[PDB]
From a paper:
Key to their pathogenicity is the secretion of a wide range of virulence proteins via type VII secretion systems (T7SSs). The ESX-5 T7SS is found almost exclusively in slow growing, pathogenic mycobacteria and plays a key role in nutrient uptake and immune modulation during an infection. The importance of ESX-5 and other ESX secretion systems (ESX-1 to ESX-4) for the virulence of mycobacterial pathogens makes these membrane-spanning machineries a key target for the development of novel therapeutics.
Here, we present the high-resolution structure of the 2.1-megadalton ESX-5 core complex. Within the TM segment, one of the main interactions required for hexamerization occurs between the TM domains of EccB5 and EccC5. We observed that the EccC5 TMH1 of each protomer interacts with the EccB5 TMH of the neighboring protomer via hydrophobic interactions and is further stabilized by the EccC5 TMH2. This domain swapping interaction was repeated in an anticlockwise fashion when viewed from the periplasm, thus generating an interlocking mechanism of next neighbor protomers within the TM section of the overall ESX-5 complex. The TMHs of EccC5 from each of the six protomers, most notably the TMH2 of one EccC5 subunit that forms a domain swapping interaction with TMH1 of the neighboring subunit, contribute to the formation of this central pore. Our results showed that the narrowest constrictions of the central pore reduce the pore diameter to slightly below 1 nm. As this pore diameter is too narrow to secrete folded substrates with an estimated width of around 2.2 nm, we hypothesize that our model, in the absence of a bound substrate, represents a gated, secretion-competent state.
Numbering used by the authors:
A (entry chain K): 145 to 308, 318 to 417
B (entry chain N): 18 to 323, 339 to 494
C (entry chain L): 288 to 502
D (entry chain J): 12 to 74
E (entry chain K): 13 to 48
F (entry chain M): 95 to 120, 140 to 167, 194 to 259, 288 to 332
């Protein structure tokens, strides 16, 4: 089942650019048609009325399904919370993309001040730069500063339009905390590239629909409610979104040692 | 560094390996899987696979998985252990929710507990008619004890023959299920009214002739049901042990005019000798080629499975199961005999009373030897239970008829302190660890309890 | 205890802390889209496993139900013991006024042994059936021990050996056979018919009628 | 709706209904409720008690 | 791959019940007289 | 009795009151075979080192294993014989590799070994560890020298005895 998702805008595109980030509620595929001919509130029988209230309340959602983020609708996301929560979620995201999408469809970049936390990513072929070769194979697309962008190939695009497909969809991850992003990153972003701001800063947090905030120690993400189908924001108030599928460094490394075995 | 040699097992194969004992399991599981797959493919065995979604894991043979972040060491894997390799199926799914309280109650109960069923109902009926017929037989025995009427013996005989024919018809017709224990319960239930029917035919006042006749015929029937059925043989082993001792006492009271104390001390001697002989006797009785009916453990192995090949496995297992059941029945019967003889000896209003209390203590230690020595949980627990019951029986035999606060306070104090010491020996003592030398010294002490019984047996005999 | 056997489900609801919904009497607002969020169970090892999500506060219903069951089983056991003890109060032989407590015992036997149909958990049902037969056993043993009549002895051993045997035959026959809806209906009604006399007969045992007849 | 606030008789029967339905869900593990023997036998109890009361009154009239 | 389908289900209409009007005062007087 | 198993070697077995099997091995070898009395699942009754010679220097392991102490292991396996055959192949493969080689005996060669052990008397020794290489020295036409290992507790305890002619 690995790397089986497809570029083309039909079919798999419903799940090509989307990533499981956690678990949480969603609206069912059954749609509750209105209980027409409701009696007036003095005539309303207590038991059946209350039972129907409870049915509408609780059958409103399916509990503990995978919660998804679409990479195609926000120019970036910014991750606010405790460091290991944020990192664990980031490793989970990276491994989800690495399993689901091949290296020819999604390429990955990590920009960091602490490369020891990111030493596991070297095994993942998606971090391999096809352009530079070394003894170990393809060059790892991990940089220690935003100034260390010697690519300039992901930075000649225009501003980004949210999808409603680029050849690789670059995912650039930053926990460098550098003011220099706002030069190469406008208010709208870059075309084929989505970003993930670790260590949430006022530069990246300028859009609450992009901020995934760990509100509870277990990794409860709050963000804005989005439509199950279009991934578009439905209303502006921040609310419970998911509990994050946080993953340890050892599991990530183990998966990376698995993924390194393959070259197709 | 330390590396543990262990066995590992998967895919109906066991392999032995040496694992880097202090590296996390998450470091080693993946190439261990590759190793196992290579070895199985070399054997022509279908290799392991991931089915759907889930993850590979290692377990102890008891079933508990190992923490992947932990090494072998700190989760107490040692050299010579066995590990079981699995792909654990994905546990997560949507949580259901039933918003209405009444429906949620009904569905949770129905899902999680077991209803009454006719399979259970027939067993319940058999149990209750067994209890009823033992009450009726014991009641007729009470009446013949109280009154000299010959007429109870026809009633006991007729109820015995009816229930025995019913049991035989059920065992013959309905042998096809493991619910033939209904017939076994009825047969166990119906041998008793036969015993009291034969016993009540002895004329004159009730006593030793009635006792020896009833126990002899009941033990004889319990011996026959071994060769004709061979099912549920622990209880019949205990019963034939009790009937052997009771018949030996009845013949000693008819052929001779021996006192009760002499016979009880003989019975105690026979008990401690038989305790010494019981495992060997069990290993003998293990091979009497009685019918082959698999008990529960053997049945539930033979469902998972099809002097060479599997027929040897089947025979070895059945033979061991018979052995363990015979041994357990024997120990229960001896336990009953031991407590009943010690209770019969320790009359408080006797001049020799200090001596049988010593016999009690010596037997108590001797039993605790076997309790620490014998492997089966329910045999060690049998031995411990009877050992305690010695003390309880002699204590009450004093304090009930000896109307003094002194003996009362002594009994009740030892009756609460002594089992608390028995608990203390495992509760506070770290995992019941003592040195092998100290263990062997305790074994010496409780062995040195035995040879004082021999002259005391002579002295209480005369 | 006869009353309490009918209260035992309601009391076992009430003690388990199940509470039935409040009612919106006067508030006149029926739509609430509050969508209660997941309680989240942290993995007991704390060992970096992701936490798991349970559906709502309503997840405690799964605990409360199992508690209610345990209460109900306790109630039926206790009431069993009490009714057997109370029906041990039949000491004298049946000549005189003493067939009335024997008749009362027979009625409460029939009532319990039919009552067992209503309880589906095997240990509640078995608890009622064992209670029912234990009534008959205790009454019979007290007649044969207190009275020295051999006829009483013969009747006691006869009922002890036949009645549970009849129960065994009923257990073997009944779940396999079909039955007529009429027979099923009278096997309902025999419950109520054997239940109803027990209070009048009880007042006969207290001689409430005679005291009120003359006080 | 906390406290000792007033309640209508239609709520009294509505609660008693939910109590019976929960009792049936507790003793049996079905909630199909088209017939219910619980009511029938508590009516039999009521018949027993009312018969004892009636006979007690019939005893009072003697002097 | 698995299957999923949308559905639309109208919820049933709750019961209706006329609120009791309450007995007039003279009825209570009559009741007390009858018992008297 | 005999078997060839899903393993690697043919293995002879004898039974009378429990199972017996023997392995030949070809200066001193390691003494640490006491651990193989307690394999990963099976529990063997004893490990006996056996040796015989003058010339005709022969050296043997004979193993005793009670199935009834091992039922929990046998029940997992398709035969009791296959169980002990595997456990002896384990010991053979553990000994094999050095200058000394090892294999299970065929039961025919087991009767040959019994004949050569008979070929047609001093005290059992309390302290033995140094004795072995000099206890061969007394003049005889035939010597049989053997050492026994038994599971007295979680350790393993040792006894040795000899006879001449």
């Amino acid at each position: 089942s690995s790397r089986m998702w497809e570029r083309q805008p039909d079919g798999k595109d419903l799940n090509f650019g989307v990533v499981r980030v956690g678990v949480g509620m969603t609206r069912p595929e059954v749609t509750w048609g209105e209980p027409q001919n409701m009696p007036t509130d003095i005539e309303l029988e207590p038991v059946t009325g209350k039972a129907l209230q409870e049915f509408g309340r609780y059958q409103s959602v399916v509990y503990n399904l995978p919660k998804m983020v679409s990479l195609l609708v926000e120019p970036w996301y910014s991750l606010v919370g405790e460091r290991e929560q944020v990192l664990g979620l980031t490793r989970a995201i990276i491994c989800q993309l690495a399993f689901s999408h091949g290296p020819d469809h999604v390429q990955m970049i990590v920009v960091t001040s602490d490369p020891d936390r990111w030493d596991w990513v070297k095994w993942i072929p998606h971090f391999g730069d096809p352009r530079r070769r070394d003894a170990a194979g393809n060059a790892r697309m991990v940089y220690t500063s935003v100034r260390e962008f010697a690519t300039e190939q992901a930075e000649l695009f225009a501003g980004r339009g949210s999808f409603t497909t680029p050849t690789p969809h670059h995912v650039i991850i930053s926990d460098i905390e550098d003011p220099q992003w706002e030069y190469v990153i406008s208010s709208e972003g870059v075309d084929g590239v989505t970003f993930f701001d670790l260590t949430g800063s006022p530069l990246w947090t300028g859009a609450p629909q992009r901020v995934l905030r760990f509100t509870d120690s277990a990794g409860v993400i709050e963000t804005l409610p989005r439509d199950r189908d279009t991934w578009m924001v439905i209303d502006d108030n921040a609310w419970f979104f998911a509990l994050a599928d946080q993953m340890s460094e050892a599991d990530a490394e183990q998966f990376a040692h698995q993924m390194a075995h393959w070259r197709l | 560094p330390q590396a543990a040699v262990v066995a590992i097992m998967a895919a109906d194969v066991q392999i032995a390996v040496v694992l880097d004992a202090h590296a996390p399991i998450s470091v080693m599981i993946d190439p261990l899987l590759k190793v196992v797959n290579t070895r199985l493919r070399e054997l022509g065995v279908a290799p392991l696979e991931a089915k759907g979604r889930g993850r590979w894991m290692l377990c102890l043979v008891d079933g508990t998985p190992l923490r992947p972040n932990l090494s072998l060491t700190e989760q107490e894997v040692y050299d010579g252990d066995r590990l079981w390799l699995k792909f654990l199926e994905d546990t997560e799914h949507r949580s259901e929710v039933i918003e209405h309280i009444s429906t949620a109650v009904a569905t949770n109960l129905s899902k999680r507990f077991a209803p009454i069923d006719p399979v259970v109902a027939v067993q319940v009926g058999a149990t209750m008619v067994a209890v009823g017929v033992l009450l009726g037989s014991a009641l007729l025995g009470w009446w013949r004890w109280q009154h000299e009427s010959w007429l109870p013996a026809p009633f006991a005989a007729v109820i015995a023959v009816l229930v025995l024919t019913v049991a035989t018809m059920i065992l013959a017709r309905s042998k096809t299920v493991p619910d033939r224990r209904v017939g076994d319960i009825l047969l166990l239930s119906g041998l008793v009214p036969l015993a009291v029917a034969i016993a009540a035919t002895a004329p004159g006042p009730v006593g030793a002739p009635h006792a020896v006749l009833g126990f002899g015929v009941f033990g004889v029937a319990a011996m026959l049901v071994m060769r004709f059925t061979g099912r549920r043989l622990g209880v019949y082993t205990a019963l034939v042990t009790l009937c052997a001792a009771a018949t030996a006492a009845g013949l000693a009271r008819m052929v001779l005019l021996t006192s009760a104390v002499t016979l009880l001390t003989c019975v105690l001697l026979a008990c401690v000798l038989m305790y010494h002989g019981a495992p060997a006797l069990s290993r003998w009785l293990s091979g009497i080629r009685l019918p082959v009916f698999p008990s529960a453990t053997s049945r539930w192995v033979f469902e998972a499975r099809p002097l060479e090949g599997p027929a040897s496995v089947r025979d070895v297992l059945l033979r061991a199961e018979r052995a363990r059941s015979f041994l357990t029945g024997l120990l229960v019967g001896l336990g009953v005999l031991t407590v009943v003889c010690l209770a019969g000896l320790c009359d408080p209003h006797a001049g020799r009373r200090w001596l049988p209390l010593l016999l009690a203590a010596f037997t108590f230690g001797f039993l605790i030897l076997r309790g620490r020595s014998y492997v089966d949980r329910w045999q060690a627990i049998t031995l411990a239970a009877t050992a305690v019951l010695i003390i309880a029986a002699v204590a009450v035999r004093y304090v009930l008829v000896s109307g003094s606060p002194a003996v009362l306070s002594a009994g009740v104090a030892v009756l609460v302190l002594l089992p608390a010491a028995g608990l203390t020996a495992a509760a506070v003592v770290p995992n019941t660890i003592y040195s092998p030398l100290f263990r062997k010294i305790v074994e010496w002490i409780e062995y040195l309890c035995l040879m004082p019984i021999f002259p005391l047996a002579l002295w209480l005999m005369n | 205890c006869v009353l309490m056997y009918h209260g035992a489900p309601a009391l076992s609801r009430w003690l388990s802390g199940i509470r039935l919904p409040v009612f919106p009497s006067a508030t006149s607002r029926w739509v609430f889209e509050a969508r209660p969020d997941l309680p989240t169970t942290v993995v007991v090892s704390g060992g970096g496993q992701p936490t798991l999500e349970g559906p709502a506060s309503v997840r405690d219903v799964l605990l409360r139900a199992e508690r209610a069951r345990s209460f109900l089983t306790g109630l039926l056991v206790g009431l069993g013991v009490l009714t057997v003890v109370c029906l041990a109060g039949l000491c004298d032989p049946h000549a005189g006024r003493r067939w009335l407590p024997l008749l009362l015992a027979a009625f409460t036997f029939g009532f319990l042994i039919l009552r067992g149909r209503s309880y589906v958990d095997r240990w509640q049902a078995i608890t009622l059936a064992a209670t029912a037969v234990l009534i008959i056993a205790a009454v019979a043993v007290r007649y044969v021990l207190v009275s020295g009549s051999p006829a009483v002895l013969s009747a006691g051993v006869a009922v002890l050996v036949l009645l549970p045997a009849a129960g065994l035959t009923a257990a073997a026959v009944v779940p396999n056979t079909i039955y007529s809806p009429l027979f099923r209906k009278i096997v309902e009604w025999i419950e109520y018919l054997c239940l109803m006399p027990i209070f009048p007969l009880a007042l006969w045992l207290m001689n409430v009628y005679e005291a009120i007849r003359y006080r | 709706g906390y406290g000792l606030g007033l309640s209508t008789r239609t709520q009294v029967t509505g609660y008693q209904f939910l109590a019976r339905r929960t009792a049936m869900a507790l003793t049996r593990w079905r909630v199909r409720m088209e017939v219910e023997p619980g009511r029938r036998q508590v009516l039999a109890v009521v018949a027993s008690v009312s018969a004892a009361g009636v006979i007690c009154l019939g005893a009072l009239l003697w002097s | 791959a698995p299957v999923v389908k949308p559905e639309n289900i109208v919820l049933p209409t709750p019961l209706s019940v006329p609120p009791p009007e309450g007995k007039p005062w003279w009825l209570v007087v009559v009741g007390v007289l009858v018992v008297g | 009795d005999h078997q060839r198993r899903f393993g690697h070697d043919v293995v002879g077995i004898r039974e009378y009151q429990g199972q017996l099997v023997a392995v030949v091995t070809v200066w001193l070898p390691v003494e640490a075979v006491a651990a193989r009395l307690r394999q990963f699942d099976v529990r063997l009754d004893a490990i006996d080192i056996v040796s015989v010679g003058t010339d005709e220097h022969h050296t043997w392991l004979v193993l005793r294993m009670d199935p009834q102490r091992n039922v929990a292991a046998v029940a997992a396996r398709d035969s009791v014989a296959a169980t002990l055959a595997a456990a002896t192949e384990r010991l053979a493969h553990d000994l094999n590799g050095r200058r000394w080689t090892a294999r299970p005996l065929t039961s025919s060669e087991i009767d040959d070994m019994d004949a050569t052990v008979l070929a047609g008397w001093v005290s059992p020794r309390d302290i033995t560890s140094e004795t072995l290489e000099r206890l061969w020295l007394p003049d005889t036409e035939a010597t049989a020298v053997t050492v026994r290992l038994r599971p007295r507790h979680g350790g393993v305890e040792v006894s040795a005895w000899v006879r001449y002619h």
